Amino acid sequence: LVIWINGDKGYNGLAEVGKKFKVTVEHPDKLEEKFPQVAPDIIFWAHDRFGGYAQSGLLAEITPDKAFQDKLYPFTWDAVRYNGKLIAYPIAVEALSLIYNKDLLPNPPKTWEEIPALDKELKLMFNLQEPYFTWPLIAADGGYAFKYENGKYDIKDVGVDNAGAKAGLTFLVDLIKNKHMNADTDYSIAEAAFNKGETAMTINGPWAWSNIDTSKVNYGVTVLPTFKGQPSKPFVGVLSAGINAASPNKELAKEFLENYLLTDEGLEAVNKDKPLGAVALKSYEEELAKDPRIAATMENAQKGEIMPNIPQMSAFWYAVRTAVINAASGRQTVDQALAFAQILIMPNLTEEQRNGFIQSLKDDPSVSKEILAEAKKLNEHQAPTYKLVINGKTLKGETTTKAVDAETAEKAFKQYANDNGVDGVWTYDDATKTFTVTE
Amino acid sequence: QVQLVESGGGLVQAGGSLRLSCAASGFPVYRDRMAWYRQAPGKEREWVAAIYSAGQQTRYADSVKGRFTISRDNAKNTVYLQMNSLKPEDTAVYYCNVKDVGHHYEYYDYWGQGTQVTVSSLEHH
Amino acid sequence: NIMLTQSPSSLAVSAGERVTMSCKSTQSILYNSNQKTYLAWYQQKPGQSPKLLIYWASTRASGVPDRFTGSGSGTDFTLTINSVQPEDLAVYYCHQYLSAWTFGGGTKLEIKRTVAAPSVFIFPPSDEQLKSGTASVVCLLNNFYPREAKVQWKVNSQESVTEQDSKDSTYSLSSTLTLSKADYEKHKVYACEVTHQGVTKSFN
Amino acid sequence: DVQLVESGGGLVQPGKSLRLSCAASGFTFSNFGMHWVRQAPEMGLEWVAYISSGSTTKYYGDTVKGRFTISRDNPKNTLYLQMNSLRSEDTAMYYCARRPLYDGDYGYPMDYWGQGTSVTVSSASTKGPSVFPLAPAALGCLVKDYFPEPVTVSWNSGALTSGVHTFPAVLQSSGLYSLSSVVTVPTYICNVNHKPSNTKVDKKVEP
Amino acid sequence: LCPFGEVFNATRFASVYAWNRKRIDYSVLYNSASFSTFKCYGVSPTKLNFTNVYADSFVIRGDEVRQIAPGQTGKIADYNYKLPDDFTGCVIAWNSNNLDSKVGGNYNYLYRLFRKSNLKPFERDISTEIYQAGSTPCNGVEGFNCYFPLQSYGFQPTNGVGYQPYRVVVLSF
Ligand SMILES: OC[C@H]1O[C@H](O[C@H]2[C@H](O)[C@@H](O)[C@@H](O)O[C@@H]2CO)[C@H](O)[C@@H](O)[C@@H]1O
């Protein structure tokens, strides 16, 4: 068996778990983008890419067991559900949390705006390259990836252009411009800084905890700070296992997932290597919820929103990433970056039309709203009386006219018949509204 | 002395895009007003877009607001009209235009040679 | 939108020889992808819906006689008929269908033949019309050529000529004189004299 | 075979609205785009409107944009054209035409046209025609004082068509129309139909 | 001393339609041998040596300097900058080919070309709304009888004295 997981997860622990079950595990770089093009027996990733994989047909639908369904949390099953069928086996629920240094600061900042001042006392930094870490601050003030109405996602509407998203991104670029956070830093640099205690506070998921546990520096985990009185709403990730459609060992991989990995011993061996967070298995989660860090993770998950599993997600991410970079490095303004993300999210646009709209937004930002409206219109456009009967000696026929009074109609028809040389007896039937003239 | 030469355009399918260029010689492109007019075959020449040096930077006709845009480049002394979501109504000859008064308030409306933009409408299989 | 100008507006020709009618385009209508010129030639017979003749300005539509051919390029095109038939009497339009759709001004084809002797008929007003308060007298010409013919009334005249029928290539004409009941009653004899290249009809 | 028939034309006042229907038979209506094209004696053929197969794309003529709306009902195989704010320039005969599949590749242009219906606009009202025989060899019947001037004259209900001469309707000084239709012969009845007045008159012509 | 260096020798002079206004030794200006036109109305240039002093700065073309005077009529005097008929103060103007003229033309400077009505003395109009020549509304959109009210000076280095860029400062007391 071949397993692909991210480089920051517990690859070693999964290796021993597979060894107890041969099983081979690898951690290739950029596996979320390598998987669609290459096609590994099973891949562990967040549920957002799994919907796109299922639409492309790369993931084989798994036959579940009702007892197995009852053994795990139901909302995880709903999250890994696409069009009413289950495409993956949930493993863990991971959400971002604020990890601060106890020695550097007694209590975490309650609001985002306090963070600048605190920072200028030290003279906060995290991963800015990936939009997963930046998104909570953008979405704190109403920004949404896709409108969720009556349980369904509206692809036609994208909320990355809301005034809340603009406010969040302009606050973040103000933090960057105040020399408070490095624009070029990534996950690895942020981790290295936090182990050495250079930075007081950071945003990270459960998986990083073990590494900090190796640095033996005291760390406190809590909810992300509120933005303008509104809490940050981080995307909730469901780290799940997807079985490849072309897997020659589909049944073996399914049995390994059901009976060996998703067990108390398997989860406790994996979590020791790297903290998975809120696990999907009920008993281990109950035995682990006593740890305050899992409680903070679950609180952040409750405050935040789970990632959609629609196939229009990955492209979205790319757009947002670009937007964040366009705001992080100062190459272009916040509003322009959000307009570019909105353009890039549109699925039906041809490459030439998309490039044209990108150029039009580049060279004139004064009418950006009208450009976006026309682009959205293009994207939607490319989405795949009284009657007379005369019986004379010469003419026989009929004629209909518009008259309000019967007397007026009979006078008009008398004039018409005289005009046509008809002179004879007249009869009228009001039931059928017919003037019958004959000789 | 003043010379306006247009380039770009040609034939594009409905919904495509184009970038008309107006190269200007004899005057800096940063001036009071540089505009783009369209003339259809058998109609009257009408105003499409314009870029100014004071007040609102760009102004557009109602029928082409959003789809079109106008920008200027000082280094290459050019005015660019970017046309998106083109429709068969946009089939016309486009002229870049300036208004320069010589000396006696009889402003010579300097026009260019004009470029043909034909926005076809054909169905493909 | 691309305008098209058809020339000549009207031409007259006998049967058996060749005709060529042109039309000019405002701009070249050559499609880049296929390198095919997008123009058609349509034939509309009098009182009939237009009938497609030629497409791509060179290809011949199904069922079109071989005598019809289309040529031209750039911004000017021509339709050529090698052996004009009397049934070919119609209006031909060149229609471009690249950017929107436009049609030409229409080129009307006339059929020339030997001069024909008109048959002259007289029609006095019917008694019913006289009862109606007005009178109308009709002078009628069957099967005459050419169109030109002068009619004079002998005791407010309307002249109506039918289109040249394709079967025989002749004309028919009506000159109608309208008078009041009193005006018709005052006079006694009514006649019309017709002068033509190829006669007076009277009644009391 | 492919057949298109128009209906709904008639006499309407300026500024009113009118609905034109085009019924198709012999081919799949939902697969082909449709055109509305009008012709007038002083106008020639002129394309008016175009609707796509799936109604996604619609185009309108420059002189009729903002007033004419084109629509279609695929299950009923019907095409509708709604005209608003009619002006005196809109008097014409309208045809519905079929745009063949993928004229960008095959290139086959508008091929099948309907019979067409005459839509006229004027402040004047309709009036039933008056039919008068002509005593004879040629004989005929003459129709006076009708409006508008779509009118069909046949002989013996179309039994005879050889020697039939019908003349274009000519405008009188009184604002009406009139025409005479005649036939050369060695009983004869001429049939006159004026649709806007719904007037069908059968005239026997005798000396 | 008064800051005449900020006024006379400033690198940037605004267009005449948006002429610069500033609030405040004159014999040095009278005999500076650098001033092409120095004409004073209501006061003697030599007797200047006053509670309100205002300096107006703009750039015009050569044959329009005579429009900066009381009672004059013309585009600069009508729609750009008008002085009162009882003006007490004066006008200075000098050639600016070396500074304001750039090779290939200098089209930065602007003047207002249209306005609905003339202007009262001592006021500045900065509005850049579309002018209506006819009666139909423009809706902030050009077209027939819809004109942009500003126009640029084509200050080419080869222009004659009549069309050369003049810098004009008006000292009003
Ligand atoms: O590129 C943005 C990225 O965000 C999320 O990726 C997370 C992933 O879910 C975690 O398991 C871990 O790898 O941290 C990543 C930080 O980017 C989305 O899951 C992913 O689809 C998206 O591309």
Side-chain angles (χ1 to χ4, degrees), chain C residues 33-54:
Chain C
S33 181
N34 290 318
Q35 292 297 296
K36 283 318 200 165
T37 306
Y38 264 50
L39 187 138
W41 286 94
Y42 274 100
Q43 172 193 52
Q44 173 169 33
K45 292 182 183 179
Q48 287 302 123
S49 68
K51 183 217 171 191
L52 177 63
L53 277 195
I54 281 171

Short mmCIF file of all heavy atoms in Angstrom, two decimals, chain C residues 33-54:
data_model
loop_
_atom_site.label_atom_id
_atom_site.label_comp_id
_atom_site.label_asym_id
_atom_site.label_seq_id
_atom_site.Cartn_x
_atom_site.Cartn_y
_atom_site.Cartn_z
N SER C 33 -10.77 31.88 -39.28
CA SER C 33 -10.56 30.49 -38.89
C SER C 33 -10.66 29.54 -40.08
O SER C 33 -9.82 28.65 -40.24
CB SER C 33 -11.56 30.09 -37.81
OG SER C 33 -11.36 28.75 -37.40
N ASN C 34 -11.67 29.72 -40.93
CA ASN C 34 -11.89 28.82 -42.05
C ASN C 34 -11.38 29.36 -43.37
O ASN C 34 -11.36 28.61 -44.36
CB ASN C 34 -13.39 28.50 -42.19
CG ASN C 34 -13.90 27.63 -41.07
OD1 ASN C 34 -13.24 26.68 -40.65
ND2 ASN C 34 -15.09 27.94 -40.58
N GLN C 35 -10.97 30.63 -43.42
CA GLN C 35 -10.58 31.28 -44.67
C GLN C 35 -11.68 31.20 -45.72
O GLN C 35 -11.42 31.10 -46.92
CB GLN C 35 -9.27 30.71 -45.22
CG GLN C 35 -8.06 31.03 -44.37
CD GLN C 35 -7.78 32.52 -44.30
OE1 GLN C 35 -7.48 33.15 -45.31
NE2 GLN C 35 -7.89 33.09 -43.11
N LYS C 36 -12.93 31.23 -45.27
CA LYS C 36 -14.10 31.18 -46.14
C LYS C 36 -14.84 32.51 -46.06
O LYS C 36 -15.06 33.04 -44.96
CB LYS C 36 -15.03 30.04 -45.74
CG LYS C 36 -14.56 28.66 -46.18
CD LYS C 36 -14.00 28.69 -47.60
CE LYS C 36 -13.98 27.30 -48.20
NZ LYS C 36 -13.79 27.34 -49.68
N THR C 37 -15.22 33.04 -47.21
CA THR C 37 -15.95 34.30 -47.26
C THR C 37 -17.42 34.05 -46.95
O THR C 37 -18.05 33.18 -47.56
CB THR C 37 -15.80 34.96 -48.62
OG1 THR C 37 -14.42 35.10 -48.94
CG2 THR C 37 -16.43 36.33 -48.59
N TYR C 38 -17.97 34.81 -46.01
CA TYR C 38 -19.31 34.57 -45.50
C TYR C 38 -20.28 35.54 -46.18
O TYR C 38 -20.55 36.64 -45.70
CB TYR C 38 -19.34 34.70 -43.98
CG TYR C 38 -19.22 33.38 -43.28
CD1 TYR C 38 -18.21 32.49 -43.61
CD2 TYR C 38 -20.11 33.01 -42.28
CE1 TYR C 38 -18.09 31.27 -42.97
CE2 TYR C 38 -20.00 31.80 -41.64
CZ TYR C 38 -18.99 30.93 -41.99
OH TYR C 38 -18.87 29.72 -41.35
N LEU C 39 -20.80 35.11 -47.32
CA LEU C 39 -21.79 35.87 -48.07
C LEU C 39 -22.66 34.89 -48.84
O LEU C 39 -22.19 33.85 -49.31
CB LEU C 39 -21.14 36.88 -49.01
CG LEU C 39 -22.07 37.85 -49.73
CD1 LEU C 39 -21.47 39.24 -49.75
CD2 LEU C 39 -22.35 37.38 -51.15
N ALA C 40 -23.94 35.24 -48.99
CA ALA C 40 -24.90 34.39 -49.67
C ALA C 40 -25.66 35.21 -50.70
O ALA C 40 -25.75 36.43 -50.62
CB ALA C 40 -25.88 33.75 -48.68
N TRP C 41 -26.20 34.50 -51.69
CA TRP C 41 -27.06 35.09 -52.70
C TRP C 41 -28.42 34.43 -52.63
O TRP C 41 -28.52 33.19 -52.68
CB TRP C 41 -26.45 34.93 -54.10
CG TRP C 41 -25.31 35.86 -54.33
CD1 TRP C 41 -23.99 35.59 -54.15
CD2 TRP C 41 -25.39 37.22 -54.77
NE1 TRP C 41 -23.24 36.69 -54.46
CE2 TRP C 41 -24.07 37.71 -54.84
CE3 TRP C 41 -26.44 38.07 -55.11
CZ2 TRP C 41 -23.78 39.01 -55.23
CZ3 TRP C 41 -26.15 39.36 -55.51
CH2 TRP C 41 -24.83 39.81 -55.56
N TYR C 42 -29.46 35.26 -52.50
CA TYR C 42 -30.83 34.85 -52.27
C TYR C 42 -31.69 35.32 -53.43
O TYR C 42 -31.56 36.45 -53.89
CB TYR C 42 -31.38 35.49 -50.98
CG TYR C 42 -31.08 34.73 -49.72
CD1 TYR C 42 -30.05 35.13 -48.89
CD2 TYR C 42 -31.82 33.62 -49.35
CE1 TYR C 42 -29.76 34.46 -47.73
CE2 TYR C 42 -31.54 32.94 -48.20
CZ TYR C 42 -30.51 33.36 -47.39
OH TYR C 42 -30.22 32.68 -46.23
N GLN C 43 -32.58 34.44 -53.90
CA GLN C 43 -33.51 34.76 -54.97
C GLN C 43 -34.92 34.81 -54.42
O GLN C 43 -35.40 33.83 -53.84
CB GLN C 43 -33.42 33.73 -56.10
CG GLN C 43 -34.49 33.88 -57.17
CD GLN C 43 -34.56 32.68 -58.09
OE1 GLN C 43 -34.67 31.55 -57.64
NE2 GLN C 43 -34.51 32.93 -59.39
N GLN C 44 -35.60 35.94 -54.61
CA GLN C 44 -36.98 36.12 -54.18
C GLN C 44 -37.83 36.38 -55.41
O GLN C 44 -37.72 37.43 -56.04
CB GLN C 44 -37.10 37.28 -53.19
CG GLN C 44 -38.53 37.64 -52.83
CD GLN C 44 -38.61 38.60 -51.66
OE1 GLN C 44 -37.75 39.46 -51.49
NE2 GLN C 44 -39.66 38.46 -50.85
N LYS C 45 -38.65 35.40 -55.77
CA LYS C 45 -39.59 35.62 -56.86
C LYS C 45 -40.77 36.46 -56.37
O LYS C 45 -41.09 36.45 -55.18
CB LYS C 45 -40.08 34.28 -57.41
CG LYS C 45 -39.00 33.50 -58.12
CD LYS C 45 -39.53 32.20 -58.71
CE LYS C 45 -38.41 31.41 -59.36
NZ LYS C 45 -38.90 30.13 -59.93
N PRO C 46 -41.41 37.21 -57.27
CA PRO C 46 -42.50 38.10 -56.84
C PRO C 46 -43.60 37.34 -56.12
O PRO C 46 -44.10 36.32 -56.61
CB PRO C 46 -42.99 38.71 -58.15
CG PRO C 46 -41.82 38.63 -59.07
CD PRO C 46 -41.11 37.36 -58.70
N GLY C 47 -43.99 37.84 -54.96
CA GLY C 47 -45.01 37.19 -54.16
C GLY C 47 -44.59 35.89 -53.52
O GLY C 47 -45.44 35.06 -53.22
N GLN C 48 -43.29 35.70 -53.30
CA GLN C 48 -42.79 34.46 -52.72
C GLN C 48 -41.73 34.78 -51.68
O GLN C 48 -41.10 35.84 -51.70
CB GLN C 48 -42.20 33.53 -53.80
CG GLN C 48 -43.24 32.86 -54.68
CD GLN C 48 -44.23 32.03 -53.88
OE1 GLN C 48 -45.44 32.24 -53.95
NE2 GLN C 48 -43.71 31.08 -53.11
N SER C 49 -41.53 33.84 -50.76
CA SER C 49 -40.49 33.97 -49.76
C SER C 49 -39.11 33.83 -50.42
O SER C 49 -38.97 33.14 -51.43
CB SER C 49 -40.66 32.92 -48.68
OG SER C 49 -40.40 31.62 -49.18
N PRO C 50 -38.09 34.48 -49.86
CA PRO C 50 -36.75 34.36 -50.43
C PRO C 50 -36.27 32.91 -50.44
O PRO C 50 -36.55 32.14 -49.52
CB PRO C 50 -35.89 35.23 -49.52
CG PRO C 50 -36.85 36.20 -48.93
CD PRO C 50 -38.13 35.45 -48.76
N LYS C 51 -35.55 32.55 -51.49
CA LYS C 51 -35.02 31.21 -51.68
C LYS C 51 -33.51 31.29 -51.79
O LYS C 51 -32.98 32.08 -52.58
CB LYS C 51 -35.62 30.55 -52.92
CG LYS C 51 -35.18 29.12 -53.15
CD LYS C 51 -35.00 28.85 -54.64
CE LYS C 51 -34.35 27.50 -54.88
NZ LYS C 51 -33.94 27.35 -56.31
N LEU C 52 -32.81 30.47 -51.00
CA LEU C 52 -31.36 30.51 -50.97
C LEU C 52 -30.78 29.95 -52.26
O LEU C 52 -31.21 28.89 -52.74
CB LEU C 52 -30.83 29.73 -49.77
CG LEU C 52 -29.31 29.63 -49.67
CD1 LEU C 52 -28.70 31.01 -49.49
CD2 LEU C 52 -28.92 28.73 -48.52
N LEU C 53 -29.81 30.66 -52.83
CA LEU C 53 -29.16 30.25 -54.06
C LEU C 53 -27.70 29.86 -53.86
O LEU C 53 -27.29 28.77 -54.27
CB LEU C 53 -29.23 31.37 -55.11
CG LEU C 53 -30.51 31.49 -55.93
CD1 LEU C 53 -30.26 32.38 -57.12
CD2 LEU C 53 -31.00 30.12 -56.36
N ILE C 54 -26.91 30.72 -53.24
CA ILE C 54 -25.46 30.51 -53.15
C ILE C 54 -25.00 30.83 -51.73
O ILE C 54 -25.46 31.81 -51.13
CB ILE C 54 -24.72 31.37 -54.19
CG1 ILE C 54 -24.81 30.70 -55.57
CG2 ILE C 54 -23.27 31.59 -53.80
CD1 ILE C 54 -24.29 31.56 -56.69
#
